[PDB]
């Protein structure tokens with residue numbers, strides 16, 4: 001009912017298209033950025049704008065026969081904090097008791113001065129509540145070993161040590177930057193009486209995801225599909241991979257030779273690939289992606305691949321596309337609350353729009369927009385909101401495949417034996433629950449330099465085991 | 481290194497290759513055969529050499545919320561007979577207690593006169609034995625409802641009626657042909673006191689596989705991957721699909737209109753695709769496939785697609801390739817007992833050969849050949865035996881994809897929505913446990929007319945529920 005608005009939207013959609021040549025370019029550039037990040041660093045790690053390529057100091061892939069007494073685990077992400085108790089039984093089996101809690105809104109507000117003590121004190125309190133609900137008989141007696149999954153870039157110096165490099169995903173607490181997060185958590189655990197709980201391991205949620213699958217993958221399943229990558233596609237995006245110790249040059253030459261002699265071959269690398277091409281040398285960029293990077297983000301100039309892929313930022317891309325279409329007098333925001341409310345449109349809102357149908361007059365879309373920002377719409381308007389949402393998602397999925405394809409190429413994981421395939425472990429609300437995301441990722445892996453022959457050898461498997469099992473495995477190994 | 485034997489095998493291997501153009505040819509021919517089989521035929525049902533396309537009289541796909549009292553089930557295949565008790569609880573959950581028993585050898589020999597009563601009398605006893613071990617409290621009191629899974633082509637005329645068309649898996653009881661197998665079973669259940677057990681449903685193991693998955697597939701999974709085909713790739717091969725009631729012209733026109741008025745749209749079709757192209761108008765044919773059809777099979781001229789794919793016949797294909805290579809003085813059978821022992825080499829034998837490696841001097845192959853036919857071998861001989869097994873399997877997998885692609889195309893099941901995907905329920909020892917089968921099937925589906933874009937929208941999923949839940953679902957619906 002408005003040919004101008006119709007053709008204005010069709011033009012915004014075409015900006016988000018990713019071509020096969022762009023996939024190939026970014027795949028080859030990503031590999032080049034991997035090689036740069038694996039070399040010794042030139043300056044402060046918090047200033048590096050390139051692929052961080054952080055060594056995690058995890059050199060042994062679980063077998064599945066590891067066993068021990070109930071370990072503790074703690075996982076701080078970008079939205080929720082969870083604590084669980086995992087009993088590794090061996091033979092690719094385990095028992096888990098877990099409690100999940102949303103990160104209080106107080107920590108995502110600048111009205112008040114938030115500090116590391118405020119956060120880790122709350123984490124230590126949730127830890128106490130979990131030990132009282134599931135192990136009330138021995139809360140203050142056992143010498144619990146805990147693994148801490150920290151879903152944020154860390155300058156890891158050992159399995160138990162590492163300072164935060166920068167906050168990401170809506171978290172801004174300047175106090176923590178540069179602090180061994182294990183100590184911070186331990187200090188608050190000691191102040192509430194849980195000094196008998198020792199945090200023995202620090203892992204990224206990518207590293208943890210890979211370890212968990214290497215353990216639970218049945219001997220039969222693992223023989224065919226070997227887990228090679230631990231991936232995340234939720235509030236943020238990131239992934240890890242095993243790199244040959246000889247190529248990790250940033251590691252001290254003595255440390256490499258000291259590790260190599262011990263019978264080790266590889267070490268996990270937390271790519272932090274949300275910070276891939278932070279200079280925007282090749283990443284697709286629109287006027288709306290710069291608005292998010294510069295005005296509405298907590299970390300301007302960093303995690304730019306993330307700002308085009310992860311679920312924290314996709315819904316915001318739509319808000320800027322719509323506000324820009326009202327500034328042009330093409331779209332009527334009516335009495336909406338979009339203006340001056342960043343991130344009011346979430347990715348969960350867009351999930352109810354990706355697969356809504358016209359035969360229902362796009363009713364789910366209508367209700368989802370009213371619930372999120374009191375925005376009324378007509379059918380013709382919802383038809384075009386869907387065309388935009390579907391374009392924002394496809395670009396996110398197609399870009400989400402570049403780091404996976406690049407890693408597989410560099411490590412030659414696809415040049416295996418007859419009938420052999422690989423497994424990429426993916427956890428996150430986007431890959432898991434967003435309609436069509438995983439399907440579109442594979443379309444890109446087929447368009448990537450590995451071709452459709454490669455996509456069929458890659459098994460994008462959801463890892464609903466959790467990064468706690470991975471950290472639990474890192475705790476069973478380390479000493480109290 | 482015999483250049484004679486080396487290139488003699490290389491020629492046998494090249495004969496088994498299936499090209500993209502052949503897949504397209506066989507796919508379109510399969511659809512032509514589907515349309516023919518859905519028209520009314522006047523001739524004898526046991527004489528028709530074309531795609532049977534049997535209406536099953538099942539018009540409702542389970543929802544997953546079905547609930548009821550404990551139902552009974554009975555599943556007769558080509559190797560084992562099992563009886564179980566399934567309690568449908570709803571929410572994609574069920575309780576199952578089952579006892580499994582091998583089909584007595586008395587039925588796998590023609591020395592003695594075997595009759596239908598001999599079979600169903602033994603079945604009725606197994607049922608009684610099961611009801612005494614697991615439901616001893618109300619064996620002769622309860623009004624048990626039973627669903628009968630009969631893994632053989634049946635001229636189904638209702639949910640509870642249908643006459644056997646032909647036997648197909650190594651055992652033949654000519655008495656049964658043309659007899660309502662439900663009645664036969666009921667008479668023997670009543671004659672041993674279990675007249676309180678009423679057989680209320682008759683299903684093929686294909687129909688059961690589809691129904692079971694529609695029930696057990698979580699609502700989330702069901703929304704993503706809709707089950708569209710229930711197929712079998714084990715002792716035999718076959719699959720079912722939902723067909724529009726209007727296209728099933730073979731069904732009485734008036735009966736259709738009465739179903740349509742009741743709110744019905746489709747009905748399951750037991751393709752019986754093992755009998756596809758029994759005239760060999762396009763199916764690949766070798767000197768070894770003719771030897772099996774005419775000399776070693778129980779039903780020469782029937783189930784010819786099956787004789788090139790299913791596991792009852794794959795191992796025999798190797799035995800004839802080996803005997804033909806000794807007749808040419810190219811291969812030394814030594815003191816083997818292959819000769820004059822049909823089916824002595826099973827598909828389980830070939831499974832230990834598909835993925836054996838040279839670094840182990842192909843020891844599994846050596847031991848598997850010695851365990852099956854006292855056939856000694858050398859390393860260079862096993863190198864070529866694997867090339868034969870790998871050629872027999874690839875052709876079997878590539879051919880196994882033709883019926884699936886044809887069905888998906890005919891119903892246009894892959895383009896029904898934006899992010900549309902489907903689920904193909906697969907049960908059977910070959911698809912489930914044979915190394916690489918599913919991997920090679922997907923390679924063929926990508927070469928089929930649905931393209932790699934289509935294969936990525938198809939989910940070849942093993943059906944770990946069993947056809948017992950499916951038959952239980954048909955019994956909970958039917959009346960006592």
Ligand SMILES: OC[C@H]1O[C@](O)(CO)[C@@H](O)[C@@H]1O
Nearest residue numbers: 151152153168236237238274
């Ligand atoms: O949680 C998702 C991902 O987001 C990051 O914070 C930044 O890329 C990573 O540390 C984490 O793995």
Ligand SMILES: OC[C@H]1O[C@](O)(CO)[C@@H](O)[C@@H]1O
Nearest residue numbers: 631632633712716717718754
């Ligand atoms: O068991 C697998 C399949 O084999 C047949 O007996 C013949 O193709 C079918 O009746 C059955 O579904």
